[PDB]
Amino acid sequence: AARRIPHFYRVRREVPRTVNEMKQDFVVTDFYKVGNITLYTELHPFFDF
Amino acid sequence: RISALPGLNNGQLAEEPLSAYVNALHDHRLWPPFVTHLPRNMEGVQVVA
Amino acid sequence: FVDALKTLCHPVLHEPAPCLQTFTERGPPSEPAMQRLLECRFQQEPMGG
Amino acid sequence: IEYSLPVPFHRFYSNPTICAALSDDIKRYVTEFPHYHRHDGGFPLPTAF
Amino acid sequence: AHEYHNWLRSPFSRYSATCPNVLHSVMTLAAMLYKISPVSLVLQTKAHI
Numbered sequence: 422a423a424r425r426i427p428h429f430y431r432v433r434r435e436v437p438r439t440v441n442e443m444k445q446d447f448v449v450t451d452f453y454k455v456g457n458i459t460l461y462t463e464l465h466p467f468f469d470f
Numbered sequence: 471r472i473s474a475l476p477g478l479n480n481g482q483l484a485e486e487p488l489s490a491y492v493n494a495l496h497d498h499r500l501w502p503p504f505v506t507h508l509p510r511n512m513e514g515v516q517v518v519a
Numbered sequence: 520f521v522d523a524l525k526t527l528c529h530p531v532l533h534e535p536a537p538c539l540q541t542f543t544e545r546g547p548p549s550e551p552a553m554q555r556l557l558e559c560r561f562q563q564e565p566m567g568g
Numbered sequence: 569i570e571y572s573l574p575v576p577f578h579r580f581y582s583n584p585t586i587c588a589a590l591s592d593d594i595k596r597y598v599t600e601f602p603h604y605h606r607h608d609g610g611f612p613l614p615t616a617f
Numbered sequence: 618a619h620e621y622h623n624w625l626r627s628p629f630s631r632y633s634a635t636c637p638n639v640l641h642s643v644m645t646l647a648a649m650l651y652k653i654s655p656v657s658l659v660l661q662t663k664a665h666i
Binding site for chain 3: 518
Binding site: 472473475477478483488491492493494495497500 | 624644647648650651652654656657660661663664
């Protein structure tokens with residue numbers, strides 16, 4: 422896992438951000454807008470989907 | 471750091487980075503007035519001597 | 520402004536073509552106060568010397 | 569520079585100011601995706617991590 | 618002399634005369650370089666700015 426770890430960074434694919442990271446960027450008053458996308462998966466306060 | 475907008479800068483909108491579409495301090499089309507090494511990404515701009 | 524995000528990003532907001540069109544059809548002004556403002560010039564020149 | 573092996577592995581301890589500047593591999597990965605200079609979250613970790 | 622073709626125009630020089638010598642005045646030239654492109658108008662408003 423140490424010697425192989427440069428070989429992940431030779432394939433030049435744009436790794437997409439996860440849904441939690443795409444959820445983190447919103448400001449407080451923008452988290453309650455229809456322009457938000459990831460509100461469909463914020464179901465439970467104590468879990469994540 | 472204060473002019474990068476480090477909150478919501480992610481991904482590759484076009485072949486230029488996202489903060490290059492934000493502030494003049496990030497895109498390689500603006501040049502500093504005094505220079506000693508022209509950068510690697512000259513291919514966008516054109517130069518005349 | 521996050522709720523006014525739609526009306527401030529149409530391309531017609533950032534097309535100067537009819538504005539320059541009617542500015543040219545307005546023509547240069549003609550009062551003797553404007554004759555201090557009207558004149559300027561810009562030349563292109565090789566940077567060899 | 570020749571006798572080290574950097575491991576970006578964690579949500580915190582990964583940032584590409586040091587590890588990507590160390591090895592030419594992740595440096596070549598960064599210089600094509602210049603919007604990956606973040607630290608909030610960060611540039612994407614390998615699939616094993 | 619290409620005032621309408623430089624990236625930095627006379628408000629920047631006019632600001633550089635009367636500014637105090639503090640870090641606030643250093644960084645206030647940075648956020649005076651935010652692009653007013655329609656892609657930036659989404660992003661800088663989304664940061665509640």
